[PDB]
């Protein structure tokens, strides 16, 4: 969009989000981290 309205917008809901998977996500590197 050549004329998108730039910047960070106000007018959003600033109150965490009680609609998310509360379970452990079994999709992460299970290996030791060499860093």
């Amino acid at each position, epitope marked *: 969009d050549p004329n998108a309205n730039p910047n960070v917008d106000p007018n959003a809901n600033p109150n965490v989000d009680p609609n998310a998977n509360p379970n452990v996500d079994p999709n992460a590197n299970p*290996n*030791a981290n*060499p*860093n």
Partner: antibody, heavy 120, light 112 residues
Framework: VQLVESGGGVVPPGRSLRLSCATS????????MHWVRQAPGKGLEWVAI????????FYAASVEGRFTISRDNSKNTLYLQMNSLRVEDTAVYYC??????????????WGQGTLVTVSS | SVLTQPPSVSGAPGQTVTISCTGG?????????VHWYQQLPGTAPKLLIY???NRPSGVPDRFSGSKSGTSASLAITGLQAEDEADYYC????????????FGGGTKLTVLG
């Protein structure tokens, strides 16, 4: 800070060889160490890391299971034991002192290097 | 080799020569800090740049660099004959088991 490689030379493939570095000028027991190598005419390749207390070790995929890294804090000495040396393991091996910056790490002090040649 | 460097760069003494290092989403665009090493013809690599912009007190203020997106770069100004060397970039690739990864190195030739 001195790091001094020793134990290079030439062996037939299939033989074992043991390299080491003596260090001085810093407290050896407070730092982790790295080994890297450079095949003649090639760039640098990371080989292995050992944690300051010896608790963790990581190896490059191309050497894991053949190489062992170890250290003796009371002797200020870092060792690398290579088993089943292959022709492809010909390289100059170097010691480096581990350092860490923020999201990634780096070596700050380096040794001089020593040459290991594998050939029949 | 997961970081790409040009094999060779050059310039006349006094000119500014830059050496690029291009990675991808797993290493540079991933936020891992980029480091640079300098190797002279018969010795061990020396840390030149660390932390993308910082340098050891033993490095002339002729060397500097930057990081942006998946790109990184080393700029050498006031090129001297003594800068003939191999320069390497280093970072961390989250897809690999090793702590460090290196580019193939770039040789800087000073056209004396």
């Amino acid at each position: 800070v001195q790091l001094v490689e020793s134990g290079g030379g030439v062996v037939p493939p299939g033989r074992s060889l043991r390299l080491s570095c003596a260090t001085s000028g810093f407290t050896f027991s407070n730092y982790g160490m790295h080994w890297v190598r450079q095949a003649p005419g090639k760039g640098l390749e990371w080989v292995a890391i050992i944690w300051y207390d010896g608790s963790r070790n990581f190896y490059a995929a191309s050497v894991e299971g053949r190489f062992t890294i170890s250290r003796d804090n009371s002797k200020n000495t870092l060792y690398l034991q290579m088993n089943s040396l292959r022709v492809e393991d010909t390289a100059v091996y170097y010691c480096a002192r581990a350092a860490y910056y923020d999201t990634s790490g780096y070596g700050d002090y380096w040794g001089q290097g020593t040459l290991v040649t594998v050939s029949s | 080799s997961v970081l790409t460097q040009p094999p060779s760069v050059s310039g006349a003494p006094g000119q500014t020569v830059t050496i690029s290092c291009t990675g991808g989403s797993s290493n540079i665009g991933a936020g891992y800090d980029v480091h640079w090493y300098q190797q002279l013809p018969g010795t061990a690599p020396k840390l030149l740049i660390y932390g993308n912009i910082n340098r050891p007190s033993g490095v002339p203020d002729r060397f500097s660099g930057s990081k942006s997106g998946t790109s990184a770069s080393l700029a050498i100004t006031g090129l001297q004959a003594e800068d003939e060397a191999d320069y390497y970039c280093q970072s961390y690739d989250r897809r690999l088991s090793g702590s460090w990864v290196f580019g193939g190195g770039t040789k800087l030739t000073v056209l004396g």
